[PDB]
Amino acid sequence: SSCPPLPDDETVWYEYYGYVDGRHTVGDAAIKDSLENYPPNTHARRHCKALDPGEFVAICYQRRGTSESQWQYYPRIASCPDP
Amino acid sequence: VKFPQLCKFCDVRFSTCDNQKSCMSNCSITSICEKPQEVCVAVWRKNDENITLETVCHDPKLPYHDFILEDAASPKCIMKEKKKPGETFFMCSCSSDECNDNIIFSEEYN
Ligand SMILES: C[As](C)(=O)[O-]
Ligand SMILES: C[As](C)(=O)[O-]
Ligand SMILES: [Cl-]
Ligand SMILES: [Cl-]
Ligand code: NA
Ligand code: NA
Ligand code: NA
Ligand code: NA
Ligand code: NA
Secondary structure, eight states: OOBOOOOOBTTEEEEEEEOOSTTTOOOSBOOOOTTSOBOTTEEEEEEETTOOOOEEEEEEEEOTTSSOEEEEEOTTOOOOOOO | OOOOOEEEOOEEEEOOOOSOSEEEOOOOOEEEOSSTTOEEEEEEEEOSSOEEEEEEEEOTTSOBTTBOOTTTTOSSEEOEEEEETTEEEEEEEEOSTTGGGEEEOOGGGO
């Protein structure tokens, strides 16, 4: 149960931290597993390459009592601007 | 500790849901709520011109559309009618993942 690193492009790159509480607080650097994947509860912080401290945009979300984990995104996310 | 949950989150969309005991949201956007304490909401409104369905996250400590989300602890979205001039208005809140996708108007269906 894990999430691969997010794809990026000329508009954006991501950092990864453990979720703490809320969309603001930055946790510890996230640690990849043996397949270079991030564990559930990883918080993805995006940096737009055209521009800012970064903004959390997603959580590696494990459904309730399941073994399936996927990136889930915060609401109303707009694309980073083109460089 | 409370983690944020998943909700359908298309904001206000035009809807073809009408004259049914239940409707699917037809919302292709599932989001994690910004705040851990937020729950899911669906709002259905019909007037002489349009029908809309709104899907959001919302903190149940705050009113939404001038009503308290008294049903926020429910796992299912059971629509309840509010009397409003000039429109028919139904709303539900719920606190299981994507629970505002399955919108129930008839008591019969839970
Ligand atoms: C619909 As909201 C997240 O502004 O309470
Ligand atoms: C979500 As309600 C109790 O205001 O219909
Ligand atoms: Cl999770
Ligand atoms: Cl009415
Ligand atoms: Na942030
Ligand atoms: Na937000
Ligand atoms: Na009122
Ligand atoms: Na009315
Ligand atoms: Na009404």
